[PDB]
Symmetry: D2
Subunit: 364 residues, 4 copies
């Protein structure tokens, strides 16, 4: 459990575009075998009917499939693909590629360094989504993912991404057939439930929330319950949960570090700057020391942002997650100077209500 | 031409809500007769089929109509109603009410103060929209509006709002019937043409662009041509142009001032802070010295923001103006601390391409 | 309780357009005092943030307000305004105006004729929506409405329209504040609950569903429970329920009749033709004997239409109610020859699941 | 040039789903080598940012790629993939697969039978789209496609599908760089231009429109100019045109036939029935003799359908093509009994203005 991690932010001209990656390989900058995870922003709506996420994975899988001489479906069990759709406003579509080599036992650098580990859960039944099963199964995956990562303590954990499923009418009907009712019948709303249960699963694992409180009823209801590390992204492309734990260990030799924080609301650029500061990035010229930023945005559920009304939860044309991503994307872009960042929407039990957790990865 | 101007930012719970205004009147803080202009943000889509703009005006007009014992349609000749739809992201719906009293005779301090004047053009034929007629007629209204305002020179001018029409299939068909073809047949696209010609009309009047270059062909085409003072907002509710000139004169006694600037792109929060700075506002606690901010946002027409791709002009679900408003709204909110600001979309010939002009109104 | 009913289908160029009505009055074809109800189709999205419904009412109210020398808010107590938003596909915006004069004493022919009666409920608390309170209060209004109408038995009842409220974040927060949780926190989804409870209220009153089964839990859950007469339309513009009972009595002298039926699914044009047939309308030239058609459309909740999959409940861009209205609008238009018909979306407990009740009003 | 054609309508559970096809192959019902064309309906928005079309092709290509041991990019030159996005209302996503074997010289049946041929054009420059180049290059491809098909005369031609490109900001910027201006700067609007020029290309080839009239200016302007055979579908996934000619020859031995017609407007179910009739399909039980229907829907550009107003061209939320597809989909479904049909939007120069051409493929 000793690793050297490489992280690459590569642009996408479209969801299917793998040329950023074909390049990294062909120019010898990364080994296909070493790749353990990919975190994408794709330009679908990031809601229920977003097939850009699936599509991106298909092409990536098939690309690595050629190189490793494996079936694409095989590569997907090997590598953690997490595609978050919805690139609104200035958000620029891209992949963030993660490669893991054995602790290049060259020399361990002085301070701790970036490490990363992954994990999968079993498939879920429709009636399990947004509920106990998903919460507890996720928590278990988080622990496996930390172990995989070689993360000593919760202190050293800085970011937990989770891809999770959602409900379609077919799934709902399937659940019904078994005499069980799904957590909701609104497909869009199911994403929040899936995200929220998953996030509480993380909160559980991180001992940020005590096991006794995590009843089904508290999911989406109890705003107070949350993980300040959790980033949840729902999707139609999968029936299981995919977990990526990211943090710091002394065993790691990466030329990279990670710090995290929390946005109090969608427009809290301050927090982000503050965290970027904490990594010793002090001018706009040092911003390119940042590989990427990962953030959670949501529409403040009380209907207000810093006292003023917002329309994001009343807008029947544009879903709130879309508003939120656009908003936070803009805020963060204004700080780091561009829109190629990972912003995901719907921060249910992820940091403060109306806010979300975020993380920064910079050169050591 | 000597005035005392009062400006009130009042929240709307909905487009028809006038209670913010009924209050101002009933608590003696403004006189219905003194009100000369209203600039609203309504929570429709701010595109073609936005009737929230019309509706807001109808109720405001009818409210002032009761108090002044006039027909609503009469009040609208008297008062300049400018309703910009589209309140995406954190943008909070509101009205900004302007009242003009003769120069409050008495003390009047050293240094210029806020003044304001209005003007209307004739109704336009469908085939005139986005074309010479609209450009020249607007320019003429701008001059009248400055005169009305008591604005000495272009130096003292800081902001020129213009409400303008747009094309519907009926209008298009009407134009066709007369053997003239409209500037476009895409209704959404017509808004840009109307906004753009109108903005060039302002550029003409402000001698920011020479008369010789302002050919029909250059409208939407020639990115280089622009006014750094122009804010254009198109709408289905009207067939003429409505102009509001805002600036500084020594003759005015307002307890208020105005400074302006330009955003280089949708995320240029810096410029805004800079301009806010220039009014002697430095801490977040002095931000409430700002009455309101007025800004123009657009999707960078070259398809990129600071080198990175954006999807705003490819998004067939959400129109670019909506993305842009959300984005700039967020940026500005992050600076002033909330979303109740005037952000309008589509900055064709309004400041830089991808950017727009903005203005701040603060306590003296 | 003996009436002569006149019904006028009038086109709208826009939501605020009252010229169709100003005409009817000025040309002596209807008396402002006689008008008892108006059923509109407005060109907003027909979802949560649709202010076209409110706006239409405001202008109608104010128009009749001038003529009756009443305040608009007074006219609204007097007249039942029901504005259904969402005019997708070929659906043409319009009002259907209902006028009631005492039984035109004189000749009156053999056979029943069209009659109509209205009713209002008290305002609802946010936490009452989609629940027992709303069900029982509606049922009570339905009875009063039949009485008003002079409708002898359930046999003679052919159509029950109900306008009902919906949930906004403010209302939700208000409910929360009182320690009660709202039926849902998804504003869009709340419309279905409001529509569904209201429809069951009608089913109760019509003895189509027994009182014992109408538990809170069964709302949106139990597809089997429904009224084949109920048409429910939710809206942000009101806090109470508005009921319009329509049917046949021997006491009435109207030159008009009404028959009803049910669509088995969104595309069941057959049923509609069948019902139109039953009124002795057989050629396309006799179609103008129809004053109007009123229909309920929904997206089949099982995710299929006649065995094939539909995407309406997965489409995060366009809400299902919008798909449904477009679909049924098209089907019905293909039969009657145009799109100026009343189609409302979301047929929860309104006729079959995936289907809805409809009614036709034709010349005697 | 003598062929036996097989046609298979296969359902898609999602855009990437190939299991319908894997089945056809594995159960020996079609040979991968014989497949010459695929016409899909995918569940994206069918507008600019629809990557469901590309994605569907990628997976199909890769599937046939395995079987033929070719690269996917190779298979795409071999096979004509035409993916039309947008499956609104009851429209059920699916592929229609076409396989061509040599005239199984068993015995030529009596009457003529279904034949089919394909063709490609060169890639287009951004500035060529919606213009002469695209018109003439398409016409040329149509002729090659007929030849390929073994179609004797224009009489024997019944349907010409064309996939064509569209404009993105990058393409527009690229064109600009060369000192040429694109046919429009609105990406959505570019689809209509691409579709329209392409359709006129077909009209040219079919001698339905004389060569002299086909000037650049007449594209989207001259409603009178049209092909009654043309079906155009624009897409972001390609830079060239893809043509599929379909018709009848005596040399063919297919167990299938094709007849075509034209819808006068979006709701003209009559025409469709009439054409279905003409193939000797007289009851609802014989409807399953239909393999598939292919239709073009558009929003009547004059803003009216059979005298009544429509909102499809004013709706800034939902694009007209989406309204149109939903509408015609519903109409056709009401006739054939379900929504698994090929309906494409935007019928510029394709049959009547407000209408479009359609075709039916049935068992002999
Ligand atoms: O931001 C996003 C997009 C997505 O794919 N699903 C989510 O729930 N979050
Ligand atoms: O911001 C804007 C731009 C416009 O043209 N008009 C609106 O209603 N909103
Ligand atoms: O058709 C409908 C359904 C509803 O609930 N209310 C509307 O405004 N439109
Ligand atoms: O119906 C459609 C969808 C698409 O892919 N592009 C079009 O122009 N037509
Ligand atoms: Mg949160
Ligand atoms: Mg500009
Ligand atoms: Mg129903
Ligand atoms: Mg046509």
């Amino acid at each position: 459990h000793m690793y050297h991690i490489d992280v690459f932010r590569i642009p996408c001209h479209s969801p299917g575009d793998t040329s950023g990656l074909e390049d990294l390989i062909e120019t010898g900058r990364v080994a296909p075998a070493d790749i353990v995870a990919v975190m994408g922003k794709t330009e679908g709506n990031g809601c229920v009917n977003d097939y850009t996420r699936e599509y991106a994975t298909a092409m990536l899988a098939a690309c690595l499939g050629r190189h490793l001489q494996l079936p694409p479906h095989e590569v997907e069990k090997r590598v953690a693909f997490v595609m978050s759709g919805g690139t609104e406003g200035v958000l620029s579509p891209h992949h963030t590629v993660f490669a893991r080599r054995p602790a290049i036992d060259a020399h361990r650098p002085a301070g701790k360094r970036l490490t990363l580990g992954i994990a999968f859960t079993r498939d879920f039944l429709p009636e399990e989504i947004g509920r106990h099963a998903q919460i507890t199964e996720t928590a278990g995956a988080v622990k496996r993912a930390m172990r995989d990562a070689g993360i000593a303590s919760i202190d050293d954990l800085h970011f937990v991404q989770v891809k999770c499923p959602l409900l379609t009418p077919a799934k709902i009907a399937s659940a019904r057939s078994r005499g069980c009712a799904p957590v909701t019948t609104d497909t869009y709303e199911s994403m929040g439930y899936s995200r929220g249960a998953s996030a509480l699963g993380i909160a559980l694992a991180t001992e940020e929330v005590p096991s006794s409180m995590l009843v089904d009823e508290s999911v989406l209801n109890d705003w107070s319950l949350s993980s300040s590390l959790a980033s949840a992204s729902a999707g139609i492309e999968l029936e299981h949960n995919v977990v990526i734990a990211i943090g710091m260990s002394e065993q790691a030799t990466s030329e990279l570090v990670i710090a995290h924080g929390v946005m109090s609301d969608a427009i809290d650029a301050a927090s982000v700057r503050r965290t970027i500061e904490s990594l010793g990035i002090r001018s706009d010229d040092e911003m390119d020391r940042i590989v990427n930023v990962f953030a959670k945005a949501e529409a403040s559920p009380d209907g207000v942002v810093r006292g003023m009304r917002h329309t994001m939860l009343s807008d029947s044309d544009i879903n709130s997650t879309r508003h939120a991503r656009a908003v936070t994307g803009a805020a963060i872009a204004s700080v780091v100077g561009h829109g190629m960042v990972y912003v995901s929407g719907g921060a249910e039990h992820q940091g403060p209500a109306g806010g979300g957790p975020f993380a920064v990865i910079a050169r050591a």
